[PDB]
Design a protein around this ligand. Structure first.
Ligand code: NDP
Ligand code: NDP
Ligand code: FOM
Ligand code: FOM
Lengths: 398, 398
């Protein structure tokens, strides 16, 4: 049996993970849950799965949680704060850590799992994006295996040969017959919205994906295709791909999740319901398989599958991300940080949908700092870009 | 370097194989070519690749070939007949045998390659279909590895886990996380032809596939979906799949070549240009890859990808094949044999398109023989069904 620390347990991916545990009680045990402020969701999960430990980011949420747990008589112990999360990620009995915190705040707990040599179920793209080569070196240095949970990188992983799967980020694509990695592709809810209407789209419209049901941050990123931008950066580290070994396609139907192009002309792809339980279950059971709760994809009830090149006038954030990778790690760390601040500002009705790409661009220009040489440098660049992004947001606020 | 005997070299798959050798002269050498009666094509191939040996099925064709080769001064030696083909398949220096003869006539040379422990690039579905468990036992008994060349089984193979790839036909699908195998799917050139017009379709119309450019036999089988019927039978042996582990879909665009359904909801698929060089190159280079001459699939210039359940009123041959597998090996051997005779009769303008399924059904009913216990029994059943099918054809001739 394999035992779990879930980072970001109350989130969309966290809840999907627990649903896989739920369907496979004889294969998977949760030792620790880590979350932020959603106390009701966390109390549901603690009462259901009886984890050894539960961590909340702030102490007030931890107290509310503990009060309810000791009333019901739960054996689950409650802690709070970032260091507690890092300790939960490194517990001896833990085999796998689901890294599903949103944003760069997930970085330190994820790195702690990595240093403890844990199998990392990686669903926190912002951490690899913001940390890059330093993240990949921490993985190589330790006994840890990365297993991509994000739907796209998971599909790529499944469609890659074993020498790459077993040496992720360090193996040579070309020697293993890989020509390129095909990153798809939904296009968001406004793929067919007139360009000139984009600025009037509300947070609720942006968070309503036709196919996916995920968190608000990721839904907005899908709308701007910053999600694909972040995944483009991440895929380059995870799979050791150059710019010429990356293609980005829009696939509106979200059936194909991504693909790998080989030298003989073959393209290998993963398909399925747009449901995170599938890629999560893939990583948790790898190299075997388990039921994930997701039913068989019915090919006779599908929409016709299409593809299209991304239009950078529609999706300026994609351009920003792809070019940030070329500009280096400081620009990338700062882009991620800015986008966290501007997406939050959009969701809090402080700026418009199209202001995200505008202010992200502005922050990048105003950033003037050196390439990070360590994790502390990554965090200084992050914190600084957050400060500049907050100032820029105030630039377009009522 | 790997060295080749090609069985059926002058055919569509044979020519596609030689094109892969052509693009990879430093990886692949042809020791022997085996063909039938197409002397011009065979002389082209002998003069180009300078094989050690060339075999033609009849002695008159061998003579015409030899006359031209010794005029030009070629070192290639010419032989004729079936036993010669079997010897070519077992030469010491041969590493791989492309089994690309059409029909059950390919059986004996393919079995000779198998007994010699050769890597079998298997593109002769009629042989496995007609020989079944006996074929798979010959493979298991010897040192031979099957590598499926047919576009569909190749796609399945690429989309299967390594434990299955390395123990093909004997490994358990369910233990390796496989729920089912999804066999696709073109539907032929008459997929959208009114049912009532099918009977007026000519051989030239039947042989014009929108996507594939292959031999006449396989093109007619694609039109009736007997191709899928034969591939259904073959896939059950190759992948150790039961009836409940097989799904058959129409995919009109021939981009997806087939798929594998896993327990967590994942579906793995191979995609590409509908071009046999790709699956051929996959098998020849396995577990590595080579350029096959096929260019990268352009997803931005594709038709929208669709799927549909097969309609047995449109494709009665599919029903015949799927039910023949249940009826056992004699019925299957006899169905294949009948279909070879009736497809030939259709191409020779002796019967109509729709007469293929009718006479195939008739032959099956008239067959009354025991399940084959050995290869000789397989050939008696085959020869007998050919005789009955010829008689039935005469039933509807002018
Ligand atoms: O899809 P997906 O994006 O996963 O869906 P979500 O956007 O819903 O995922 C967000 C998850 O990250 C957690 N989180 C946010 N900040 C912190 C923090 N600093 N420390 C620990 N956990 C944090 C959230 O906790 P919560 O929702 O309880 O605030 C939640 O579990
Ligand atoms: O696609 P695909 O179906 O491959 O394309 P084809 O239908 O063109 O393939 C047919 C191939 O099988 C060969 N063949 C037929 N009968 C025999 C025989 N009894 N002995 C040896 N070879 C034979 C043909 O030789 P040929 O075309 O020279 O008669 C040809 O090379
Ligand atoms: O893990 C799943 N995702 O990343 C969501 C994909 C939505 P997009 O294709 O619009 O980025
Ligand atoms: O190897 C390639 N084929 O089998 C040709 C497929 C044509 P179909 O899908 O109509 O059977």
């Amino acid at each position: 049996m394999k035992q779990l620390t879930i980072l970001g347990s109350t989130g969309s991916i966290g809840c999907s993970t627990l649903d896989v545990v739920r369907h496979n009680p004889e294969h998977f045990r949760v030792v620790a849950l880590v979350a932020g402020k959603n106390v009701t969701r966390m109390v549901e999960q603690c009462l259901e799965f009886s984890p050894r430990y539960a961590v909340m980011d702030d102490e007030a949420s931890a107290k509310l949680l503990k009060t309810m747990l000791q009333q019901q008589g739960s054996r689950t112990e409650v802690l709070s704060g970032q260091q507690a999360a890092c300790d939960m990620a490194a517990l001896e009995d833990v085999d796998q850590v689901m890294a599903a915190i949103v944003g760069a705040a997930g970085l330190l707990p994820t790195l702690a799992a990595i240093r403890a040599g844990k199998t990392i179920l990686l669903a926190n793209k912002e951490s690899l994006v913001t940390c890059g080569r330093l993240f990949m070196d921490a993985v190589k240095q330790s006994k840890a295996q990365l297993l991509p949970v994000d739907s796209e990188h998971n599909a790529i992983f499944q469609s890659l040969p074993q020498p790459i799967q077993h040496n992720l980020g360090y193996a040579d694509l070309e020697q293993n017959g890989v020509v390129s990695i095909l990153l798809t592709g939904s296009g968001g809810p406004f793929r067919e919205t007139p360009l000139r209407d984009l600025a009037t789209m509300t947070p609720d419209q942006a968070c309503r994906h036709p196919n996916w049901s995920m968190g608000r941050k990721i839904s907005v990123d899908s709308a701007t295709m910053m999600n694909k931008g972040l995944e483009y950066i991440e895929a380059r580290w995870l799979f050791n791909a150059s710019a010429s070994q990356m293609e980005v396609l829009i696939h509106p139907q979200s059936v194909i999740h991504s693909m790998v192009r080989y030298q003989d002309g073959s393209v290998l792809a993963q398909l399925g319901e747009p449901d995170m339980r599938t890629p999560i279950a893939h990583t948790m059971a790898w190299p075997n398989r388990v039921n994930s709760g997701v039913k068989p994809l019915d090919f006779c009830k599908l929409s016709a599958l299409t593809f299209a090149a991304p239009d950078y006038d529609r999706y300026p954030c994609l351009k920003l991300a792809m070019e940030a990778f070329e500009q280096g790690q400081a620009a990338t760390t700062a882009l991620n940080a800015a986008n966290e601040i501007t997406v939050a500002a959009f969701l809090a009705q402080q700026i418009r949908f199209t202001d995200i790409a505008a202010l992200n661009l502005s922050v990048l220009e105003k950033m003037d700092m050196r390439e990070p040489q360590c994790v502390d440098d990554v965090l200084s660049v992050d914190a600084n870009a957050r400060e500049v992004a907050r100032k820029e947001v105030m630039r377009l606020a009522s």
